[PDB]
Design a protein around this nucleic acid. Structure first.
Lengths: 134, 260, 185, 60, 144, 182
RNA sequence: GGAUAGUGGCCUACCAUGGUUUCAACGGGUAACGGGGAAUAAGGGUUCGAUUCCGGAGAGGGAGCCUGAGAAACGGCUACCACAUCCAAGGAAGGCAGCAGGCGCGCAAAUUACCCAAUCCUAAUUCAGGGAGGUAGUGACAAUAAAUAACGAUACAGGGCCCAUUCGGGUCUUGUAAUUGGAAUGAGUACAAUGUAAAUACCUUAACGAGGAACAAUUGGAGGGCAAGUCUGGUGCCAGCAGCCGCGGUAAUUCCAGCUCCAAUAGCGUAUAUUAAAGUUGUUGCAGUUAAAAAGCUCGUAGUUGAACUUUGGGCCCGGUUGGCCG
């Protein structure tokens, strides 16, 4: 990089979520955008927690380059990071595994196929398997 | 139209909440509570929009459910719980206690109170009657009924309440020379030492008020809340002291004073 | 459905469309101040129309009145900070006497020419919309900028974007490499 | 008529012909520079006979 | 005393005189009689659309004596049969009988482009293919 | 409004049912390419039926295909590309003329355009445009659509009652083709 | 008295004869859901408001009802009417004016997409759910900003004019310069990164990307109104053209083209409606001898309007502002 010098401005110590939240001001002369992964090194090193205690997001770069402003998070423990932070961010940080639920309308069609059967329904498949098997 | 409303669209939110016009269609509708809807303030608006302790409403649920936070010594985990005027919001984050009180500008403020003052709230009597088995009881402005009051207390006085219990310590008679906090009305949040009162048998009994700069004004009696004797507040007034200004001296202060 | 985004158009079309004075008198402005459409004049007529309306209502009000003093002083002061109005004419009787060459004096397109190193007033505009010039820490690529008279001591070429440094660009790359280096095989 | 042509492609090789349509006059410089070219006609130079001018004259 | 009663409690007769005298303009009679919805074959619409019955030609007013080549449209939404003008020269060969023309008026609220005795609508689009563009040879007209 | 709806149904006794009904459809490739069998292949994937059993390599060229999903029965014709008069005498009977186009090879100036003009001057009942190349995507991951502007834009110049040219390489696009036929 | 959650002709019984009205009842019409608003901007108005918020009403048409705190609930039921679906013919089943789609209709309106990440809502509930809502697609409805080129050299004509010893070169600007040179770029593409629920896009940025036919701007006009052509040829009521006045029975200022010019400019043009212009709706503000208009005259109710007159002046301090040599 080229002398990034992250500034972490508007710091609020937030105990009831157990975190420090703040706005991340990133200079970056002569280079492009600054790539969250690199930031979570470069500010866990100054918040002295750990990489995976740190969440960072936003960062719309300034017009005509050279500055980017985003919003940051650093927790106390990585456990209490993982209990409060949204599940999509932990997917971004590797701290979770994206669970494969199906497509939305496909799930819905399964949901409306359950209103048409009362009970456990295994009796019904124990009925069709004799009434249409003869 | 078939029963009550569950929703409340933005644009129909009370304006002192200071929500944004964008970001979503709906605003939190306060649940039924101690306070009226229109002049309440929910906890969600109190946290994420005033204190900025949270960003999302989901974060607010995560705050309230872990219990962390309590109105009037009681935990109150509901998100749209309508906290209102002269209420004491207690957090365990660094022993912060908030008293919801109004401003010059007529908005609820972040007004931090010290913990000894966070014990008690005040409450305007709205009625005094006789309950079943002939028991007298007062009704404060926010629902708190109280059994067996001192019979000197009658309507439109105020009452200091313990909040460890429902016990009253002290009361203030509604009279001239007493400080008045104006809740509701055009003149919301001005503190000004009654001149006198008009009767108007038949409704809407006006009240004359004269603040510390002789800006005499009048509100209706329903927007009156006495908070003590002359210069003697029973609560911690916010920065402003009920000393609403011109627009002309706010360009004295707000761009002439703080500047270099 | 969420709140309607409010919006309002700027320019104001002229009422008589072929008027031999106006058609010619506008085009002198188009010449010296380097504007691409007559619309860019009309926008200035509209801004001036709102300052002349707001000033014209306040003159129906009296002196020592808080609305005229407040809204008046805010009007005037806002026009002083953009350098449209000069300094001695802080009266509000004068803000009716403004005209279009005072707003068009303060476009950044002309502030770069009048400032220096943009030789022309067309070369200045090309310097704007081609990302070269800046105001400060910020680059501006939009001509109609209204430089606010404190920022006059800050207009310069950008840190990036040559004329300002660190690179030659595209065309000097193709010359200095793909011709001058192309002499090497 | 026949449109498809080399508007199939966005653009790679449209019409590889250095054949003159006109002789450096097939194009008016449009937009901001066309009001440069009109300020330099309608105010820099040209008149017919005395001030009351025909701006599109009879060629003579 | 200049006709009308200027008395301070005489507002009623003012506004009732006025309501009697607004039925003097043409346009205010058009609005409140609902004439745009009863007569006037475009049923209160700018345009309409119709089937061409046949192609005609004119012998119009003096001095301009000629054959101006109008057509006969029957509208769809009414079943009314109204004559129609075809614009820029040629373009009678673009339409045929039993085609789908889109109509619009001339620009006078009806009557004429000029000498034309009783033709009020011009044709804008045949078969959806826009007579301006056909006349300038920018599209083509398929048959039907 | 009931007389008009009554005539609107009395129009549609002829085309509706498994009994007393048939549509006539012609698939014309405006390139030499494509071998328009596959147009019917792409277009009958969206029947979800056993009408893909007909259209084998067995050459029939007129198909009495019923579709279950729209209760319509079609007479799909493909004429030969050699006999030009077969093409002009096909759509001289037809009800729809589905035009193939190509992403790869341009529309033939001397043959394909003459097909569009000549059908277009003898009288077309109705007409639908189709892009059917896989190389509508396979050439172009270069923001794949833009050939759609060339073929819509090209395709309007003959008959501008057509807004868009349908792709048969996506699902509901092909479905709308099938609906519109049915 | 009944009935109602409750006042009440809400309903029954008995009794009385009242209640509204030209200060316009009642009846008819409304291409009439009502407001907050919108358009037009001297003032005063006129026209619109189905449509993001509030309030009402309806879920094919009427009626009835269950359950519940709350429904006369229709993504509840019952019947009838009108439609219409499967049927083995015995029966069974339904209401998109939710979302996306169709079909008709029309002058006139997009995707059978992605997701609960925001916004908020519901439940036994931080977790589940939500076509409420959001994201993308389509989208020239409307808005905002604004690319289609900037600069040099040489040479010819200048307008200046450098010091006016100027009779030195051109201080400095115009054109035509195919005479030339580099120099700067985005539209576009693209490794990446940010963006995002995941994506597309934007803001960033490696690599690549002007030279003219290129990375080619239209739409309207060129008699007057209304600014720009009688210039060059064609045509001779011959079609044309023309909102209005008209141009052309032939040396076309208007038709047809070619140049050239104008106006607006990623927009422009037409239809229809409406506002302005309109002091052609008139309260401000019209007109009535002769141009449209004074009723054939008088009485006369409602309406509208209606003479004057009833402690005035003088003292007397208090008493805030403005203005000042006083500063």
């Amino acid at each position: 990089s080229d002398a990034v010098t992250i500034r972490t401005r508007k710091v609020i110590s937030n105990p009831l979520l157990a975190r420090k939240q703040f706005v991340v001001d990133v200079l970056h002369p002569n280079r492009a955008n600054v790539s969250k992964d690199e930031l979570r090194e470069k500010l866990a090193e100054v918040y002295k927690a750990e990489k995976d205690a740190v969440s960072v997001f936003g960062f719309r770069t300034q017009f005509g380059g050279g500055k980017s402003v985003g919003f940051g998070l650093v927790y106390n423990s990585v456990a209490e990071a993982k209990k409060f932070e949204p599940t999509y961010r932990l997917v971004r940080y590797g701290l979770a595994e994206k669970v494969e639920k199906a497509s939305r309308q496909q799930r819905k069609q399964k949901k409306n196929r359950d209103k048409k059967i009362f009970g456990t329904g295994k009796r019904l498949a124990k009925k069709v398997a004799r009434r249409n098997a003869d | 139209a078939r029963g009550p409303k569950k929703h409340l669209k933005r644009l129909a939110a009370p304006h002192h909440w200071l929500l944004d016009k964008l970001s979503g269609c709906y605003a939190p509708r306060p649940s039924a509570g101690p306070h009226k809807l229109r002049e309440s303030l929910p906890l969600i608006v109190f946290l994420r929009n005033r204190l900025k302790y949270a960003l999302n409403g989901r974060e607010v649920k995560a705050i309230l459910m872990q219990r962390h936070v309590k109105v009037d010594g009681k935990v109150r985990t509901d998100t749209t719980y309508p906290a209102g005027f002269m209420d004491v919001i207690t957090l365990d984050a660094t022993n912060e206690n908030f008293r919801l009180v109004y401003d010059v500008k007529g908005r609820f403020a972040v007004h931090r109170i010290t913990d000894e003052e966070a014990s008690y709230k005040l409450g305007k009597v709205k009625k005094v009657q006789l309950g079943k088995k002939g028991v007298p009881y007062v009704v404060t402005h926010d629902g708190r009924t109280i059994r067996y009051p001192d019979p000197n207390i009658k309507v439109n006085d105020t009452v200091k309440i313990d909040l460890a219990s429902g016990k009253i310590t002290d009361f203030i008679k509604f009279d001239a020379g007493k400080l008045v906090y104006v809740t509701g009305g055009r003149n919301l949040g001005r503190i000004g030492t009654i001149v006198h009162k008009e009767r108007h048998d038949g409704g809407f009994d006006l009240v004359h008020i004269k603040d510390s700069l002789d800006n005499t004004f009048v509100t209706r009696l329903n927007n009156v809340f006495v908070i003590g004797e002359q210069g003697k507040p029973y609560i911690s007034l916010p920065k402003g002291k009920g000393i609403k200004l011109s627009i002309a001296e706010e360009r004295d202060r707000r761009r002439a004073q703080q500047g270099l | 459905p969420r709140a309607p985004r409010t919006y309002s158009k700027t320019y104001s079309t002229p009422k008589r469309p072929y008027e031999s004075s106006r058609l010619d008198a506008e085009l002198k402005l188009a010449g010296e101040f380097g504007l691409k459409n007559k619309k860019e004049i009309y926008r200035i007529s509209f801004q001036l129309s709102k300052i002349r309306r707001a000033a014209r209502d306040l003159l129906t009000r009296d002196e020592k009145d808080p609305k005229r003093l407040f809204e008046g002083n805010a009007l005037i002061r806002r026009l002083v900070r953009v350098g449209v109005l000069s300094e001695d004419k802080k009266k509000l009787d004068y803000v009716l006497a403004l005209k279009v060459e005072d707003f068009l004096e303060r476009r950044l397109q002309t502030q770069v020419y009048k400032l220096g190193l943009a030789k022309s007033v067309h070369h200045a505009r090309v310097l704007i919309t081609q990302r070269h010039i800046a105001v400060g820490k910020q680059i501006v690529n939009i001509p109609s900028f209204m430089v606010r008279l404190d920022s006059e001591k800050h207009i310069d070429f950008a840190p990036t974007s040559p004329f300002g440094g660190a690179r030659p660009g595209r065309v000097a790359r193709r010359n200095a490499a793909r011709k001058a280096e192309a002499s090497g095989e | 008529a026949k449109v498809h042509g080399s508007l199939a492609r966005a653009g790679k090789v449209k019409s590889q012909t250095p054949k003159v349509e006109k002789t450096e006059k097939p194009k008016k410089p449009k937009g901001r520079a066309y009001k440069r070219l009109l300020y330099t006609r309608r105010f820099v130079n040209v008149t017919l006979v005395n001030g009351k001018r025909r701006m599109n004259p009879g060629p003579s | 005393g200049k006709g009308k009663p200027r008395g301070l409690n005489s507002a009623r007769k003012l506004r009732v005189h006025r309501r009697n005298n607004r039925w003097a303009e043409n346009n205010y009679k058009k609005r409140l009689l609902g004439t745009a919805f009863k007569s006037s074959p475009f049923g209160g619409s700018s345009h309409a659309k119709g089937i061409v019955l046949e192609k005609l030609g004119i012998e119009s007013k003096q001095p301009n004596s000629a054959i101006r080549k109008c057509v006969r449209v029957q509208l769809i939404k009414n079943g009314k049969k109204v004559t129609a003008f075809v614009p820029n020269d040629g373009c009678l060969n673009f339409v045929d009988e039993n085609d789908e023309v889109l109509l619009a008026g001339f620009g006078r609220k009806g009557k004429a482009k000029g000498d034309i005795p009783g033709v009020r609508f011009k044709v804008v689009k045949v078969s959806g293919v826009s007579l301006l563009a056909l006349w300038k040879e920018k599209k083509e007209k398929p048959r039907s | 409004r009931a007389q008009r709806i009554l005539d609107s149904i009395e129009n549609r006794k002829l085309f509706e049912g498994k009994n007393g009904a048939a549509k006539i459809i012609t698939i014309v490739p405006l390139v030499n390419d494509l071998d328009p069998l596959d147009i019917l292949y792409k277009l009958l994937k969206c029947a979800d039926d056993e009408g893909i059993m007909v259209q084998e390599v067995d050459s029939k060229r007129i198909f009495n295909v019923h579709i279950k999903k729209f209760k319509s029965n079609l007479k799909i014709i493909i004429p030969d590309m050699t006999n030009f008069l077969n093409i002009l005498d096909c759509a001289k009977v037809a009800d729809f003329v589905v035009f193939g186009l190509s992403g790869v090879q341009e529309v033939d100036e001397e043959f394909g355009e003459q097909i569009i003009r000549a059908l277009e001057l003898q009288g077309i009942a109705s007409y639908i445009g189709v892009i059917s190349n896989l190389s509508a995507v396979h050439e172009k991951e270069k923001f794949q659509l833009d050939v759609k502007q060339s073929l819509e834009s090209y395709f309007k110049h003959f008959f501008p009652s057509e807004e868009r040219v349908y792709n048969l390489e996506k699902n509901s696009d092909a479905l709308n083709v099938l609906r519109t036929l049915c």
